[PDB]
C-alpha cells in the first residue's frame, strides 16, 4: 500500500516551507538564491541524488533510488532541527519538518524492505553533527541555512519527480 500521492503532498508542503525560508533569509539577510550567494567554503556532506543511485528515467530502479531517498530524508531531521532554530520564529511550520521528513523516510523505508530482502535500518540521528551545526556562531549560521536549504530543495524536488514516475 505505497501511498505516493500522500508522500507527494508532504514533499510539496516541505518544498513550500523550504521556499519560505529562502525568501525569509533573503529578506532579513540579503543572501538570495542566485543574486548574492555566500562567499564561503561548502564543507559538509549533504544528501544528494547521484547517478550511482540510478534515479533518472534511464537506468532507473526503485531498489537503489528509494534507498537514497529514505536515507536522505532521515538525514534531514538533524538539518531541520538546525533550521527550526534559525527560522522557527519567522516561518510557519518549519518546526514540524523534522517529523515530516522522518515520515517520508519511514514510509519509503517500508517500500524498500518490501522491494528487497536486504533489511534496512533508518540511519543514526547524528547528534555530533547537530552539535557542530548548532555550534556555528553569528553570520555564518545563515550560510549553513543557505546550503542546507539548497540541498533540501534539490533533493525534495527530485523525490517528487521520482515518486511521480514510479507506476
Amino acid at each position: 500500500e505505497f501511498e505516493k500521492d500522500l508522500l507527494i503532498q508532504r514533499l510539496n508542503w516541505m518544498l513550500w516551507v523550504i521556499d519560505e525560508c529562502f525568501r525569509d533569509l533573503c529578506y532579513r539577510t540579503g543572501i538570495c538564491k542566485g543574486i548574492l550567494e555566500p562567499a564561503a567554503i561548502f564543507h559538509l556532506k549533504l544528501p544528494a541524488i547521484n547517478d550511482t543511485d540510478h534515479c533518472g528515467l534511464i537506468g532507473f530502479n526503485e531498489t537503489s533510488c528509494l534507498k537514497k531517498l529514505a536515507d536522505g530524508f532521515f538525514e534531514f531531521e538533524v538539518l531541520f532541527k538546525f533550521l527550526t532554530t534559525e527560522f522557527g520564529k519567522s516561518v510557519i511550520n518549519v518546526d514540524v519538518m523534522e517529523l515530516l521528513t522522518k515520515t517520508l523516510g519511514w514510509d519509503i523505508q517500508e517500500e524498500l524492505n518490501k522491494l528487497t530482502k536486504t533489511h534496512y535500518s533508518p540511519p543514526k540521528f547524528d547528534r555530533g553533527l547537530l552539535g557542530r551545526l548548532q555550534g556555528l556562531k553569528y553570520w555564518v549560521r545563515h550560510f549553513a541555512s543557505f546550503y542546507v536549504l539548497s540541498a533540501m530543495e534539490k533533493f525534495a524536488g527530485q523525490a517528487v519527480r521520482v515518486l511521480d514516475s514510479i507506476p
Binding site: 532579513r28 539577510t29 540579503g30 543572501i31 543574486i35 548574492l36 550567494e37 555566500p38 562567499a39 564561503a40 567554503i41 564543507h43 559538509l44 557542530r132 551545526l133 556555528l136 553569528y138 553570520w139 555564518v140 545563515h142 550560510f143 549553513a144
Partner: protein, 301 residues
C-alpha cells in the same frame, strides 16, 4: 568545518544612540587568493542599499571600513560583499547594529507585603532605553541570599518574590537594571518586613443595637489573620445613610487591637453606614483597604 571568506568587526554591536560606529570588513588571505580580490573589491550594503564607494576607507589591502556617525536608527543591518570578477557579487559577512541607551538607576524603590501575598517591590524605571532591559530584585539577610526575582516583560517596574515573608528579621533589598549597554543598581534599602504590611481589611462587619439607648450602635468585626504578627490600629468611619461625607471616630480611641466598638451620640431612629480599616499600630506600614460597608439603625428615642 563549514567556513567563511571573511568577517566584520566588531561582531554584533550594541551602541549608544548618537555615537559613532566604525565597522571593518576583513577578507581572509585564502579567500583573496581564490577570488583574486582584495579590500578594493569590498562593497558595503545596509538594509539592501549599496553604500556609496566614496564613504569606504581601505585601511589595508585586507580591509575596508565604513563609519556611521551620530547613529539615530535603532537597528542597522550592515553587509560586506566582494565584487568577484564577472560582476558577480558574493556575500562575505553581515552584522546587525543595535543602538539605544544604558539603563538609568532605578529609584524610589519601595516594598510592601500585602497580607496573603509574598513581598512585592516597586521602583521607577527611568528613561526609555530602546533596548531589552532586565530588572532584578535582589534580597538577602546578612546570612542568607534569597532567590533573585526577575521582573516580567509586562511589569518591568515591579517584582513579587517567590519566598514567603519572614517578619522580625532585617532584609536587604535592591534592584539591578541591565541591558546590553550597562548594568546598574538602585540604592540598597534595609527593613524589617513587619513594617511594610498591608493587612486585609477587617471583615464580617456587623452593626448591633447593644445598649438600650437611641444614640448607640455597636460595631463588631473580625480582624485579619495578620493580627498574629502585628498589633492593629484602626480608622472607623461612619455617616448617616444620607450624609455625603464620612465622619470618623478619633483614632486615639481605636489605637490598639480590638473586635468591637460602641459608637455614641448618634441621632435616634436614624440609619448609619460604617466602614473600617487597619494597619500596624505604630503607623509603620500600609493602611488596608476599607472593609465592606455595614449598616445599622438606632432605636426610636
Amino acid at each position: 568545518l563549514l567556513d567563511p571568506c571573511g568577517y566584520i568587526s566588531p561582531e554584533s554591536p550594541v551602541v549608544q544612540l548618537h555615537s559613532n560606529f566604525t565597522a571593518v570588513c576583513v577578507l581572509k588571505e585564502k579567500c583573496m587568493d581564490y577570488f583574486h580580490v582584495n579590500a578594493n573589491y569590498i562593497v558595503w550594503k545596509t538594509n539592501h542599499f549599496t553604500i556609496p564607494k566614496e564613504q569606504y576607507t581601505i585601511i589595508n589591502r585586507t580591509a575596508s571600513s565604513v563609519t556611521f556617525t551620530d547613529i539615530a536608527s535603532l537597528n542597522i543591518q550592515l553587509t560586506c560583499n566582494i565584487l568577484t570578477f564577472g560582476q558577480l557579487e558574493q556575500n562575505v559577512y553581515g552584522i546587525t547594529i543595535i543602538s539605544g541607551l544604558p539603563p538609568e538607576k532605578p529609584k524610589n524603590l519601595s516594598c510592601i507585603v500585602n497580607e496573603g501575598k509574598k513581598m512585592r517591590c516597586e521602583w521607577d524605571g527611568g528613561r526609555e532605553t530602546h533596548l531589552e532591559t532586565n530588572f532584578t530584585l535582589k534580597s538577602e539577610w546578612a546570612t542568607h541570599k534569597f532567590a533573585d526575582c526577575k521582573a516580567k516583560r509586562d511589569t518591568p517596574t515591579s517584582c513579587t518574590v517567590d519566598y514567603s515573608t519572614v517578619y522580625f528579621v532585617n532584609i536587604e533589598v535592591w534592584v539591578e537594571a541591565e541591558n546590553a549597554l550597562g548594568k546598574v543598581t538602585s540604592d540598597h534599602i534595609n527593613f524589617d518586613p513587619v513594617y511594610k504590611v498591608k493587612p486585609n481589611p477587617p471583615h464580617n462587619l456587623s452593626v448591633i443595637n447593644s445598649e438600650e439607648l437611641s444614640s448607640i450602635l455597636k460595631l463588631t468585626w473580625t480582624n485579619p489573620s495578620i493580627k498574629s504578627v502585628i498589633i492593629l490600629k484602626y480608622n472607623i468611619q461612619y455617616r448617616t445613610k444620607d450624609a455625603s461625607t464620612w465622619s470618623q471616630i478619633p483614632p486615639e480611641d481605636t489605637a490598639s487591637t480590638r473586635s468591637s466598638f460602641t459608637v455614641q451620640d448618634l441621632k435616634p431612629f436614624t440609619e448609619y453606614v460604617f466602614r473600617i480599616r487597619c494597619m500596624k499600630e505604630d503607623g509603620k506600614g500600609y493602611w488596608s483597604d476599607w472593609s465592606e460597608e455595614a449598616s445599622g439603625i438606632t432605636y426610636e428615642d
